[PDB]
Amino acid sequence: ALGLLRTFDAGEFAGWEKVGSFGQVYKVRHVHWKTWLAIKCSPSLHVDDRERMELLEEAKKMEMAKFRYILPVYGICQEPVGLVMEYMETGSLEKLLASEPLPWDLRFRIVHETAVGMNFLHCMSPPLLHLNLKPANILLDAHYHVKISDFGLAKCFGTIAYLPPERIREKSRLFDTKHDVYSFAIVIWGVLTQKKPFADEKNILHIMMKVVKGHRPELPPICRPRPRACASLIGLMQRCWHADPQVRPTFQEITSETEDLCEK
Ligand X SMILES: C[C@]12O[C@H](C[C@]1(O)CO)n1c3ccccc3c3c4c(c5c6ccccc6n2c5c31)CNC4=O
Q: Least separation, in Å, of the C-beta of 218 and Cl ion? A: 22
Q: Which of 119, 114, 136, 127 is nearest to 40 (CA)?
A: 136
* Binding partner selected for residue 87 from Cl ion, ligand X, none, CB under the kind-specific 5 to 8 Å limit: ligand X
The residues with which 263 forms a beta bridge, in sequence order, are none
Q: Which of 186, 219, 216, 221 is nearest to 201 (CA)?
A: 216
CA separation for the pair 55, 60 (Å, rounded): 9
57 contributes a contact to ligand X by CB under 6 A: no
Instruction: Show the site string, 120-139: x = touches ligand X by CB under 6 A, - = not.
Output: ----------------xx-x
CA separation for the pair 77, 84 (Å, rounded): 7
* Binding partner selected for residue 155 from ligand X, Cl ion, none, CB under the kind-specific 5 to 8 Å limit: none
Task: Name the site residues for Cl ion (rule: CB under 5 A).
Answer: 226, 228-229
* Environment class of 73 (CB within 10 Å of its CB; exposed 0-12, middle 13-18, buried 19+): buried
38 contributes a contact to ligand X by CB under 6 A: yes
Question: ∠156-121-166 over CA atoms, to 5°?
Answer: 65
76 contributes a contact to ligand X by CB under 6 A: no
150 contributes a contact to ligand X by CB under 6 A: yes
CA separation for the pair 185, 123 (Å, rounded): 19
Q: Which of 8, 13, 25, 229 is in the footprint of ligand X by CB under 6 A?
A: 25
Q: Least separation, in Å, of the C-beta of 233 and Cl ion? A: 10
Q: Least separation, in Å, of the C-beta of 84 and ligand X? A: 10
Residues that bind ligand X (CB under 6 A): 19-21, 25, 38, 40, 71, 85-88, 91-92, 94, 136-137, 139, 149-150
